[PDB]
């Protein structure tokens, strides 16, 4: 589904992303915005047989398995289809694992280019969460 900005903020806060390994809630909301526009159904094909899935565009080459990607590593040990659910549980758990690597949120190019080092709290500011 397509989340409302505030609706996603509340959901992400509920799912423990606010202050997860130091990253404030706005960071994840902003990343969600630029990656898929709060759309859990968003998918994107890449030059390799890999595909990005969900509200946070998680790659099938490293993080999830769709049974049709060469060199799949399935780091999150999860079916990519689980990342398309209107239920963000799986996408969040996987994100938390990605950000647990030495590079943290730098895994998301869009976050680096349009969120990293900005007033990301602007993204949850206004919402009555």
């Amino acid at each position: 589904k397509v989340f409302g900005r505030c609706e996603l903020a509340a959901a992400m806060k509920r799912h423990g992303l606010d202050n997860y390994r130091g990253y404030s809630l706005g960071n994840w909301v902003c990343a969600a915005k630029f990656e898929s526009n709060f759309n859990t159904q968003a998918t994107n094909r890449n030059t390799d047989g890999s595909t990005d899935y969900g509200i946070l565009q998680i790659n099938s080459r490293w993080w999830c398995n769709d049974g049709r990607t060469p060199g799949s590593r399935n780091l999150c040990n999860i079916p990519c289809s689980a990342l398309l659910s209107s239920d963000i549980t799986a996408s969040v758990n996987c994100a938390k694992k990605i950000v647990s690597d030495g590079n943290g949120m730098n895994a998301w190019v869009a976050w680096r280019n349009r969120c990293k080092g900005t007033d990301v709290q602007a993204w949850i500011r206004g919402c009555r969460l």
Partner: antibody
């Protein structure tokens, strides 16, 4: 099904180095984040640190300077190195996946002279 | 500073068939990043609940968790014969990850 198994000297002398090995079977060491957890007497658990799928590491600050975690991609194992041990390092050592879904049987390491 | 997790009571004696609630409290808010482990004697820890209340496929349904922030609870509806032993909570919200002191589930007689 992925399985883990710890191995190493069960006895280490004070001031010397503690070394353990965790053999990954069923999958690749590159297919997950792996960690070392120790249990001191009195049921006191300590998360020593972990090594990512990329080889990146995070160490418990209390152990920073004494600890080192590495892996070997061709043998599918990762290791723990703990220097300048003292009797206080005596404990049961376990290797586990980051997700906590898999654990080795654990192996006791005793520091004594 | 390192997050401290306090579990209570230290020990709990119960009769199989009874329900019990185990408490874990954090010195700081950790949202839903609290996990529950069971460790029986001579066995390594087994993950029962992840992220405060998510169930693990393969774990008996009598096990469930709740709470958020700094107050969490592990519930066991009708404790069973093979459920006795140590129960520990662990947070993964901040590094270093930390474990609580654990609660011992013992048999009442």
């Amino acid at each position: 099904a992925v399985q883990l198994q710890e191995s190493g000297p069960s006895l280490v002398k004070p001031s010397q180095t503690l070394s353990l090995t965790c053999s990954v079977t069923g999958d690749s060491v590159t297919s997950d984040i792996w960690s070392w957890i120790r249990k001191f007497p009195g049921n006191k658990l300590e998360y020593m640190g972990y090594i990512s799928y990329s080889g990146s590491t995070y160490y418990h600050p209390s152990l920073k300077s004494r600890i080192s975690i590495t892996r070997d991609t061709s043998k599918n194992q990762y290791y723990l190195q703990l220097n300048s041990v003292t009797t206080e390092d005596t404990a049961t050592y376990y290797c586990a996946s980051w997700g906590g879904d898999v654990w080795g049987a654990g192996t006791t390491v005793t520091v004594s002279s | 500073m390192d997050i401290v997790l306090t579990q209570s009571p230290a020990t709990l004696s119960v009769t199989p068939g009874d329900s019990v609630s185990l408490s874990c409290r954090a010195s700081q808010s950790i949202s839903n990043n609290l996990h529950w482990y069971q460790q029986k004697s001579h066995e390594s820890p087994r993950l029962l609940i992840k992220y405060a209340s998510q169930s693990i496929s393969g774990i008996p349904s009598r096990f469930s968790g709740s709470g958020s922030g700094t107050d969490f609870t592990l519930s066991i509806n009708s404790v069973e014969t093979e459920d006795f032993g140590m129960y520990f909570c662990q947070q993964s919200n901040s590094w270093p990850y930390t474990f609580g002191g654990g609660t011992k589930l013992e048999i009442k007689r």
